[PDB]
Nucleic acid binder design. Sequence first.
RNA 1: AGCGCCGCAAUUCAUGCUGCUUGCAGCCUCUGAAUUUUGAAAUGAGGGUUAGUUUGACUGUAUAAAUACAGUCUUGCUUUCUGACCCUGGUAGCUGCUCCCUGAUGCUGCUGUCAAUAGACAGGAUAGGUGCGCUCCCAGCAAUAAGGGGCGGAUGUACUGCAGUGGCUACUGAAUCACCCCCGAUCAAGGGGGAACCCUCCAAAAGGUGGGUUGAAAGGAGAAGUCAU
DNA 2: ATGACTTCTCAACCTCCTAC
DNA 3: GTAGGAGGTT
Length: 454
Amino acid sequence: MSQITIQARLISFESNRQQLWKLMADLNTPLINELLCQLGQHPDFEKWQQKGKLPSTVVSQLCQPLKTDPRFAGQPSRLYMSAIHIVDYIYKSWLAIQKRLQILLTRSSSLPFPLVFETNEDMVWSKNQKGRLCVHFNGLSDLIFEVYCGNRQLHWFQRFLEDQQTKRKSKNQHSSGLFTLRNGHLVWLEGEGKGEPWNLHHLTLYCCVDNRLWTEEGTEIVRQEKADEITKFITNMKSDTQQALIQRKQSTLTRINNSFERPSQPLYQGQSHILVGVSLGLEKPATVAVVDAIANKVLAYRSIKQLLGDNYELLNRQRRQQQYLSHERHKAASELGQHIDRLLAKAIVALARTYKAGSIVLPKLGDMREVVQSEIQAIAEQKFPGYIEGQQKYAKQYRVNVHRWSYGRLIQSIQSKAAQTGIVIEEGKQPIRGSPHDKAKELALSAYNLRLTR
RNA sequence: AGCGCCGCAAUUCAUGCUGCUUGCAGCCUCUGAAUUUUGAAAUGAGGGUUAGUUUGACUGUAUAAAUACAGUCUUGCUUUCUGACCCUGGUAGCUGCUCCCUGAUGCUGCUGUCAAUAGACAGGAUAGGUGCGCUCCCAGCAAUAAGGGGCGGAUGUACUGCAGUGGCUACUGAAUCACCCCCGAUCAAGGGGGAACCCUCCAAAAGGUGGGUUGAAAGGAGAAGUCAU
DNA sequence: ATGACTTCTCAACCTCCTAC
DNA sequence: GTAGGAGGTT
């Protein structure tokens, strides 16, 4: 639900970058391409066309002969792990797309393929003599890498180092299931210029981080969920490898109860009856209402001009840019609408926290096309009362001047920002032919009625 | 003139205002919602220029909670706007076509000085518009196997025109800056000096010691297909 | 060939081989 | 002999 990627840049002298480029681009990327092709020619793919699922063992079984091949001989085992993880994720995504929508598919790109680290223990964080946080992976451990990141992400790497030190200083009595780092990706940003490829492309890292583990009080929720899941797994499981796995899990239960020296923050105890609802239209991208769901009195309405206070110019800039790109496309992305959606999501979450709202509701994407069409028809009727030609011309001009808002990105941003504090995301039926504040209030009451029925 | 945007005034009000009657009454000082009008405040600028400031993390005190204060550490990632800065270009190579009239469509439009003019030299984004941009109009322009008229070269129904049009690449020039300069580093590291303002001490004053200011925001990433034209 | 949608994913303990 | 690095394995 809540998993935040953390950016960093790995910096070292020339020999390290040269070794990484000569070991990944020359070996690892062709290795991944070979796995892709060889599973493409696998006879079971047609069988995998019948049902959209993949065994977790066949990929490793196919990759095992290539490990001993002289072409792909020199590489750490964790990098083979990375290659098979990448091919498994890619083919699982392909199978999921094929199943939902119900053949060579090699990626065409100049940059080398990412290195994925599913095991968080692979990277070893160590403070440098100067004060930086050198990091090295499982394998190629003597090629260190200083991390560069902003002050807004330095605490994540500091807690990576702190968690590793607490694990090492406790004689491995702590568990890695509570580590705030889960997954890692090593790529290049394709720095523009001229020179050697290893000395030209900036090497960067993405660290998948679970925010629910940030606070000591929040770690308890993750601990309880993991304990319940693994207890269900072990009670369903009840064979040498199976016995080894069950003993590992039963040791993980004992290991997960150890205390971590983490900051403690009060959990967001939002009132279950104070709903906050978001309504999306075309004349105004979003309006917010706060209701009590017990006494039908609205605590606060909020227009988009208040959520974007001191930033409302950016909405007009986004609309102008969208019109310009539409005109250019008709004649033959600035990544600003995403920023606007994130601003709106943060403003709505801050509003809900300030008014002590325990649940945020926002409409589904399925009804959005009908909502846009109804809004266009309603505004055309409001402008031109009765004659069809006037409403049609006004609707055409209005749609040409201003386009839709790409609401799904806003939905994702709201969900991601609400998962940070712990506000329940809910859906509701968008009402038709009403004021945006009236629409938001009716959506909130409909959501409360649906929750009452459930 | 149609449409879209800012806020100027007015009206109805609250998501606002005080006392509570804590749910009803009045009001528009502030913050905002809906409608009409409107060209004195705002939106609005052609191409780029940063290891760019802040929006950070932790520990305590107060608000029972938003939040503020005090202390410690600090880092440079993907962005987003404002402000400031240089130019509206110079070289070489490769490469599509071809005319008189009539188009759809599309491009250009700043200021000053010589030349009627093409074309040169300066300034310089306040770049043709109602306050502001646009698939909208205001002018000029424009190429082609879009239509028509063909002419010469030319034996032929055969081919060319009747010096201009677009695209690509390498070397490349100015900013390589968030008060402004100097030096230095550009997979690494900053150092030095100076102007204005504010606070405190010394201090008759002038001045000197110590500190700060000289913009503000947001963050989930990887790979893939799908759809619409 | 170009902007949104979406479904996948976001491991964890254990064992063997060095070092002074 | 404990601490750290490389590899397994579902």
